[PDB]
Design a protein around this ligand. Structure first.
Ligand SMILES: OC[C@H]1O[C@@](CO)(OC[C@H]2O[C@@](CO)(OC[C@H]3O[C@@](CO)(OC[C@H]4O[C@](O)(CO)[C@@H](O)[C@@H]4O)[C@@H](O)[C@@H]3O)[C@@H](O)[C@@H]2O)[C@@H](O)[C@@H]1O
Ligand SMILES: OC[C@H]1O[C@@](CO)(OC[C@H]2O[C@@](CO)(OC[C@H]3O[C@@](CO)(OC[C@H]4O[C@](O)(CO)[C@@H](O)[C@@H]4O)[C@@H](O)[C@@H]3O)[C@@H](O)[C@@H]2O)[C@@H](O)[C@@H]1O
Ligand SMILES: [Mg+2]
Ligand SMILES: [Mg+2]
Lengths: 924, 924
């Protein structure tokens, strides 16, 4: 039963959601909803990014979740997802407008479990899983690194023995004169102090482990003709594949409802309290592991952490970084409550008053230990940073609803007044100069150095007056009209309030009397909708010209702190310097709501007595007056960025969902749920400065207007040179040589320059599809979910560090294994450019070489279960006893054009492991 | 129904508790429990101090509250007290031992409301009250202040015109030569700059107001044969009589229980969430208001805050202090949850597993605004202090219980394992040098001065193995035996665990067959108990020799920060000085549990068919091996304090409770509940250093061993001198003169010195009593509660500032009105010493003059209510509709020997106002 019945609403089967055994319920439905993309890195937490109906605005695109009627935007990884009874995604503006003023990016409606009338249920779910690291990037070992360095040296024509890295090469020339390597030897110690012995270290294996996931849920549900209740407890723990990274969560939910008199005075509440403790991986840990050469030992001769010495590249020890980061644990208390009262003066009138609260409290204590890894050190700096953050949101809602059933005319009239009110704050203390260097001793009182205090606060409010009218004739013609008047504190008084209408029409064709002979066609419905929604998800301080006293106490990398503190006297400090103010942004009093107009046309069908069901949707979204933060013109200086309504986005999309469930003669019940979706995104208008800086695409070379959001312009790589004749015949370019990348001459001017660039990257897949298969046979249930993406291109940064030598900022870094298969006179059958120590050709430029085909098809979740026969369970007094074994991310298929691995995560983000899970469910 | 039936247990009628309409339920039963003293200052919060059975130890004496089986020690002012169904105070060690290892100071058992089986109830309570400031200290006005100063000047023989305060006196001599004042005049401006005009300011009226108290509670309760639930919402707000001080609290409680199978698997939970926001009064605000003379105007000529100028005494403006303190608001989130599961393998066996959690989160932001009140200033210092505190306690409990009913023998055997685990932390950031000077702008990021970071953490754990055996023969002979094995993390491994036994006997004399002819004697029971309990409420870091790197970043008054930072180079600072460590305390590995042995004998009676009931109890408490923090010997230096088991306290007490309820011929139902209690406290052993410093009594002159806790030694004032002959005849003393205090010569050596001191102060009342009267007549219910204390002495500090002139640290301060009635040749009929500007006689010394009789009898609460007749309520569908008007602290009677006012609060603490409340209860 859809909550709108006349809009683009997707109902997710919650039973299949819990099968995947994911902490985040949103991550579970990664590819089960058409036109809704979920991207998850693979960290122990269930944090993921959601994009509904593509990219719809130049602002925050997270959809508005609704739990028990209370809206929010925080991720669901911090809430217990095992007590959800229904999930509905409202991807249509007309249908989702009535649920809030933040519905521009879509609304996901989540309903929690409630006690079923007249019965009691208890469910205990246990789950133990092992997560294994699968996407192991192949990097050069010691011998391979030496061979690659020798190849680069001989290709450049330099002496390979001058590497000054302890490698001594015995080599010569063949009959054709091409250099050949006979053998290599290494010095025992990398430094003259004999403190860093040479070793063959697998850094990826050193920093990875086999994670353990535990999940225990216990829920009890109570129903009656007269009231109901529900109490759930949950514990989740996930150890990541990366060492010293973990995430655990305790959860307790209590829901209840009471009916007084006979039917009047229905008072209900839903509350949940969660406590999540997490240690996250340091930024660029995978990059650090990939960059550091395998010759560096984990431990030095004296037992301290190993590190680069002499001429080895400056990279920290990833194991040491993980060890020092294991104490950066943060605790997060989440609190989602709601209490509502419903009054019924007579049969058709309802008055609902609702109060919802969301309180979040985050406490963290970060430590900075002194480290000395060879030549890598922080000058013995030890510090503590105690940070506290508070978020407090509350919403009050009043709803008046009237229903009439006059003849064949059904009429629902609803009005509503809503207030939303959010306040955020944070403050932190910073201390230095510690002695014991242990988390027990590192407290700000125990410090003996410079101290810093940081602190800020913000907030906003929203007011909404909405109305909804639904008319039904003969249960065949449906009309819906909703109107919203929304105001926010982020806008000035003149442009505070805005009006948004939406209309929906629906015709149940099967109800018409002219096709009663079509017995096979069980149900057919055609619906259309045209709606407008408002977007105001911008910075709270958007219309003010901000001047802030930035003294410079905040840590900055590179010294570009832009602080306001100058030693005007010239005494080299020694006290409190005079300070001032700096401009952060220029105010704009003409900012108003961004208007997103959505037109949707859908056809729902069901054939063969509800056996073959499905839906087909086509949508057109047009966002105008987009509140974008334009940067300064360049001579406007600091604080030149300002918010302006100068945007325009278009999204044209198709979605198709199908489902076929049927039994078999010998007792097999098969259910197939297929889904496919495609969309095209375009930017029609954009501010000149925004298009110039290329923050939304174009790389600052060409304007992204008229092209897909995020599209990138680069050169075109027409293979590599294989002879001097090819270099001479090709158009002249700097650094052209044998074995170097050849770049196409777009304008045919005879010279390769910055004007020889074109659109090369389009981050829009041709189509994304999913398929769920459920088989039941003799108490055996098998679930198999496949997700595929076709026609998507990806920019690969790992390729830049695997197909080239000395293509990074610093040289002598560790590279990929496939680098060994580079072009050479001895090995002409290769497309990888020849190794070189100098990037004369400038191959780090954006080009089609780094663009790879990201199409993939992976088995997201497979599960085989066994249900104990009812007689044995009744003997053991359990109403339902089930066991199951599942595999998540077990298998994947990728295109041959993708040189790397894991097309879903082709970069240095958190890896996605393979989960092998065993679980049991008891229904006492 | 008592939960022990064989110990000293007092059951408090919760219905009478809610009548007083107090936020703190503990404050409501201030004098309704024998042998239990409640002291409340009168602040908007319900915070109060509880002492059960007198002072029982030299450590923290707060009793252990128990809510829904979870123990705690936090005050109940931060929890909703309107959803309590039963309150039981266990004042006996034997009865309260089984409830925890922290039962040395008594256990208060609080049970929350739960849904009554087979029915639904909703109650809505509204209450609006006005609090009026009654204890207005009478201080001298401008003319009275001038007259008093002139009298002091003429008594001292000096020229009254040299006061240099703008007072010009026209005066002369009478026939007898005694000075007489004819008139006085004042300069218009107190300073030569004409910025502080003279005025007659009533500072007490200026800083006080009429407070408004609002209370709104809404509870719903759900019962069934098969499960139950309860949901309560509450809002409280109290504006104190002192301006810019307030306290509000939101509360939400959800309780539920579910029964599975038939009777096995009973799963229940009780959760409550509270949010209290409070602004407290600054320290010594009443003292500041009393000290500042009335001549100082509230506002200056330019509109700024008025302040002392010229020779006026240095005192801040209390109104300015309150105005600057109005932004020091702290928010406190309290979280008390519990979840339990009960299993019944068969009829007599029960297994209960309980998990309780208490999470408290306090966030505060204090501001230091620059002030310039005449000559009072802070050199334009502006600062912000953002403080965060976290408390997290959790308890796990396992209980196995077996019951047997063999013939007339009833046997209960219970064993239990309990773990308690508490962790506390706090951290704060400090910033300076602000410009706008508003709470919106004062954030640590906006500061431009020196920053400080403070932070600390601590915690402890408790393990308990307890057993309880109850045997009943013929329902006439009762025996109870409990044994506890308790260990704490605050002790070393050798002395970690301790064993505590307790035994209880009971005989129902009325059940014997030899007195069946005594029909009037309905019930009679005689019980005895001997128990031992353990006390370990000490500092967590008690056995460790503490060395801390106190750099000195903490603010200190007077400069005695004892910081560790020295400019060893001699450059007047300019950087980070070298630091070190200092000793905080000396460890003691021999510390163990403090053993409190309690012997109780009680007689319970009920006569005339449960019409005249009552109880009489006698108790003897002996605490030995008391963990006391002895100070250093004096040459041991800093950190010489250490914890040692060298204490011994004795408490001998009597309690008597009586109750008589009966109807009348014409339809009047009268119920009287009287209570009386008395106790004597003594200290038998004490460390030599502790007795020398006199922290527990004696004022450092004589050892408190063998005397009451808190007893004070001082001189004896034998009136005042009235002639030179009296001075000559009396023993010689320094400063002796006409009109000065005469001090008794205790040792008869002819000279008054420091050896002429004796025990003068004993802080133990002769007896404390209470009386509750409840009258019902024709839908009119009248409640009247009186509380009286007799035989208590109080040290008065207000008297020192009201009966003497220039008796404070600084001169020319404002004094009390009764100072005008001082002894003089013109007014010989007075006992107040003559005014003087020099304290030559040293009348500030501790003496019997400042000891006053604190006996009082006050009407704590009176309430008149009207209940709507049942027919009208049934017409309006309400099951019960009631209105009421009440007065709290309306009337009091004090002894004539008490010169001041409000004997309950005879000092500069928060005043106790008179509350006039109107409330309604609806039982829809
Ligand atoms: O991130 C910018 C923006 O986020 C806000 C608004 O909620 O708060 C986020 C703060 O969290 C910070 C570090 O403290 O990073 C986010 C990490 O903290 C976690 C903890 O669960 O997330 C917290 C917060 O972000 C979501 O996860 C986003 O959906 C929400 O579910 C949740 O409420 C964790 O998920 C992240 O790793 C940092 O970004 C912010 O201080 C604002 O404070 C801030 O403006
Ligand atoms: O007071 C010393 C001792 O108290 C602890 C242990 O709980 O925490 C008290 C902290 O609160 C401080 C200021 O932050 O003063 C107490 C004021 O805060 C309130 C807020 O409700 O009380 C908090 C805390 O103290 C009780 O009230 C005592 O019964 C408890 O009910 C409640 O848990 C308020 O009542 C007081 O005005 C300060 O004393 C402490 O930082 C320890 O932290 C500390 O060692
Ligand atoms: Mg060209
Ligand atoms: Mg003497």
């Amino acid at each position: 039963r859809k909550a709108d019945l006349t809009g683009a609403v997707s109902v997710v089967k919650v039973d299949e959601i819990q099968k995947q055994g994911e902490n985040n319920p949103v991550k579970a439905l990664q590819g089960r909803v058409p036109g809704m993309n979920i991207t998850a890195d693979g960290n122990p937490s269930g944090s993921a990014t959601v994009r509904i109906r593509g990219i719809g605005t130049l602002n925050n695109n997270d959809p508005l979740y609704i739990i028990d009627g209370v809206p929010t935007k925080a991720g669901m990884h911090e809430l217990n997802g095992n007590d959800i009874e229904s999930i509905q995604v409202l991807k249509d503006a007309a249908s989702a407008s009535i649920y809030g003023s933040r519905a521009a990016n879509g609304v996901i409606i989540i309903t929690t479990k409630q006690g079923k009338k007249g019965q009691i249920k208890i469910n205990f779910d246990a789950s133990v899983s092992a997560s294994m690291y699968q996407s192991k990037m192949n990097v050069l070992n010691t011998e391979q690194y030496g061979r690659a360095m020798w190849q680069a040296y001989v290709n450049d024509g330099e002496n390979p023995n001058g590497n000054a890295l302890g490698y001594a090469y015995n080599w010569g020339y063949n009959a054709d004169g091409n250099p050949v390597l006979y053998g290599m030897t290494l010095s025992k110690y990398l430094d003259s102090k004999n403190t860093m012995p040479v070793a063959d270290t697998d850094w990826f294996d050193e920093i990875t482990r086999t994670g353990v996931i535990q999940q225990y849920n216990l829920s009890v549900s109570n129903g009656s003709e007269k009231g109901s209740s529900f109490f759930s407890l949950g514990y989740y723990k996930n150890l990541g594949v990366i060492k010293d990274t973990d995430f655990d969560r305790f959860s307790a939910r209590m829901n209840s409802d009471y009916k007084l008199i006979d039917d009047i005075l229905t008072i209900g509440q839903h509350f949940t309290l969660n406590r999540t403790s997490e240690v996250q991986a340091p930024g660029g840990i995978i990059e650090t592991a990939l960059d550091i050469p395998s010759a560096i030992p984990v431990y030095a001769s004296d037992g301290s952490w190993g590190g680069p010495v002499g001429g080895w590249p400056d990279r920290r020890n990833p194991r040491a970084v993980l060890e020092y980061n294991k104490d950066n644990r943060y605790t997060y208390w989440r609190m989602f409550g709601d209490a509502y009262v419903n009054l019924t003066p007579f049969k058709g009138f309802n008055l609902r008053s609702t109060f919802g609260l969301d309180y979040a409290n985050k406490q963290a204590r970060y430590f900075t230990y002194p480290y000395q890894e060879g030549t890598q050190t922080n000058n013995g700096k030890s510090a503590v940073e105690a940070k506290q953050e508070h978020w407090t949101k509350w919403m009050w809602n009043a709803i008046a609803t009237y229903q009439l059933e006059v003849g064949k005319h059904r009429g629902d009239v609803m009005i509503g007044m809503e207030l939303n009110r959010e306040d955020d704050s944070h403050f932190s203390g910073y201390k230095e100069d510690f002695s014991i260097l242990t988390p027990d001793y590192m407290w700000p009182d125990a410090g003996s150095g410079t101290a810093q205090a940081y602190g800020a606060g913000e907030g906003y409010s929203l007011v909404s007056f909405f109305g909804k009218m639904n008319y039904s004739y003969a249960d065949r013609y449906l009309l819906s009209l909703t109107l919203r008047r929304d105001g926010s504190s982020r806008f000035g008084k003149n442009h505070r309030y805005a009006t948004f209408p939406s209309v929906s029409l629906g015709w149940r064709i099967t109800q018409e009397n002219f096709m009663k002979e079509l017995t096979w066609l069980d149900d057919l419905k055609l619906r259309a909708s045209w709606g407008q929604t408002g977007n105001q998800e911008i910075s709270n301080l958007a219309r003010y010209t901000i001047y802030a006293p930035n003294y410079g106490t905040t840590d900055s990398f590179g010294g570009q702190s832009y602080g306001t503190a100058y030693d005007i006297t010239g005494s080299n400090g020694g006290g409190v310097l005079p300070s001032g103010f700096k401009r952060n942004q220029i105010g704009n009093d003409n900012i108003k709501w961004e208007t997103t107009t959505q037109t949707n046309v859908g056809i729902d069908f069901s054939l063969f007595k509800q056996s073959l069901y499905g839906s087909l949707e086509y949508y057109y979204k047009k966002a105008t007056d987009i509140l974008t933060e334009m940067a300064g013109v360049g001579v406007l200086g600091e604080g030149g960025s300002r918010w302006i309504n100068s945007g325009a986005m278009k999204n044209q999309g198709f979605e198709f969902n199908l489902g076929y469930r049927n039994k078999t003669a010998f007792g097999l019940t098969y259910d197939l749920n297929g889904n496919i979706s495609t969309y095209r995104n375009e930017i029609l208008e954009l501010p000149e400065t925004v298009a110039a800086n290329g923050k939304f695409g174009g790389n600052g070379v060409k304007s992204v207007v008229g092209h897909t959001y995020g599209a990138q312009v680069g050169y075109i790589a027409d293979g590599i040179f294989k002879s001097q004749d090819e270099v001479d015949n090709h158009a002249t370019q700097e650094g052209a040589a044998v074995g170097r990348i050849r770049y196409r001459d777009i304008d045919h001017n005879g010279v390769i320059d910055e004007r020889d660039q074109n659109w090369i990257y389009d981050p829009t897949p041709s189509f994304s599809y999913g398929l769920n298969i459920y088989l039941e046979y003799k108490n055996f249930d098998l679930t198999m979910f496949w997700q595929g993406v076709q026609g998507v291109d990806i920019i690969s940064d790992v390729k830049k560090k695997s197909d080239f030598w000395s293509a990074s900022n610093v040289g002598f870094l560790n590279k990929g294994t496939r680098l060994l298969n580079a072009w050479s006179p001895t090995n002409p059958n290769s497309d990888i450019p020849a190794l070189t120590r100098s990037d004369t050709n400038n191959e780090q430029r954006v080009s089609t070489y780094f663009v790879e085909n990201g199409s993939f098809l992976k088995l997201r979740n497979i599960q085989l279960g066994y249900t104990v026969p009812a007689v044995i369970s009744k003997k053991m007094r359990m109403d339902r006893l089930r066991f199951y074994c599942s595999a998540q991310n077990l298998l994947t298929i990728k295109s041959k054009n993708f040189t790397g691995e894991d097309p879903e995560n082709p970069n240095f983000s958190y890896p996605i492991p393979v989960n092998i899970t065993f679980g049991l469910n008891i229904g006492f």
